[PDB]
Amino acid sequence: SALTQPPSASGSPGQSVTISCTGASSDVGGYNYVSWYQQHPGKAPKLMIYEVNKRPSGVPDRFSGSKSGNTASLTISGLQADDEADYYCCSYALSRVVFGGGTMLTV
């Protein structure tokens, strides 16, 4: 299926924001096949959150992820100036990656 993301997000520095992602599919393996990417204007994206109960190395603890049912959530504790970028969620359950419409996060 296709993923749905808000058109844009807004939040003051220091506070927290949440990005919604509805439409993630599943299979006989599990329900945690959700990944997040951050792409700054003028460069390639970067894997920020994958397997939301975990996170890769070199990524600060400010980026957190969760999932309740068919909706995924991206929690950012602290907002900074270098956080303005397009955040996409990806579903890779049925051997097929699908990128959502994306959201514009501005501080």
Binding site: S26, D27, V28, L94
Partner: protein
């Protein structure tokens, strides 16, 4: 061809004596159509496992 030839084949001989002398065969009514009535449904999520 005819019951005489049938009872001849049953007796395995070209000459048949007086009387029935055997049971010719058994009548069996055959079918004329087919009725496949299974249920009514949508496809199977085999992609979720394979």
């Amino acid at each position: 061809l005819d019951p005489l030839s049938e009872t001849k084949c049953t007796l395995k001989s070209f000459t048949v004596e007086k009387g029935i002398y055997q049971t010719s065969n058994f009548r069996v009514q055959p079918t004329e159509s087919i009725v496949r009535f299974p249920n009514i449904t949508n496809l199977c999520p085999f992609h979720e496992v394979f």
